[PDB]
């Protein structure tokens, strides 16, 4: 918690969510997208609308959000607000 508190403070000291998270502007952000269908809620034939419950798994790399675990008590993974 103290280690994670220090880490979270360090990572977002000068972070920007405006620009793409790349170390060079010519680099392309590569996102792996995977859909999980939990429930088929409805199929409205009159209005031609299908309602579904889904999870939209998205995986990418932020090159400004790396750290060495040894410098932060061995913390290897965290959960942060999106």
């Amino acid at each position, epitope marked *: 918690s103290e280690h994670e508190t220090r880490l979270v403070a360090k990572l977002f000291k000068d972070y920007s969510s405006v620009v793409r998270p790349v170390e060079d502007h010519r*680099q392309v952000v590569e996102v792996t997208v995977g859909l999980q269908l939990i429930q088929l809620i409805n199929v409205d034939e009159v209005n031609q609308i299908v309602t579904t419950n889904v999870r939209l798994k998205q*995986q990418w790399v932020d090159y400004n959000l*790396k750290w*060495n675990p040894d410098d932060y008590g061995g913390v290897k*993974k965290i959960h942060i607000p999106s």
Partner: antibody
Amino acid sequence: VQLQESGPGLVKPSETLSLTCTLSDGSISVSTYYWGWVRQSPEKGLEWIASIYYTGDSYYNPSLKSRVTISLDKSKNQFSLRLRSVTAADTAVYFCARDHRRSFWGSGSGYNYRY
Amino acid sequence: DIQMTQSPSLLPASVGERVTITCQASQDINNYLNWYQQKPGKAPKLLIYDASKLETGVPSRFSGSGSGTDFNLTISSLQPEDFATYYCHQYGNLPVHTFGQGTKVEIKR
């Protein structure tokens, strides 16, 4: 978050050396990574064996391409190496590694890559 | 194909010294070169990528430089935990890799 190798520590000559790398806290189906094998020996230093993509594309060291089969398993989040016709020259420390691929855009050429 | 020659095979040095390891490529590879450090009984660790960029969490003592053919890994002030075996690694546009021979840094006396 971690990679773990597993396989026999001793192989008889001419048999097939089988190794399996398992991912801990991660998925093998990621577009930005290849999954590869690199061996280290006192006499040869580090030597890359092969790499595989999650879609199945494989790339091999030209010297070892004939004897090497790199394979994938998405259900178990594993990737394995099978080196055939193994002899005494193959004694080494085998590491499984993640080849981090960065994509770059060239005007008129498209995607180019670094590792 | 591309072959990498790393020199010296052995670099004795003391704490505070400035040391330089060299890697020579047979062909022109631009800056498609990375550097790795390996302590005894441990996996290699990435230090520099693209031949001049420092990976996050690496001390500023390490620097890399070079263009096609000739490349360099410099340590400005050698410290007790920088004694290890250093490797140059070459890659292409495809995941085909060639590791240079190791260079060991040992204690001088």
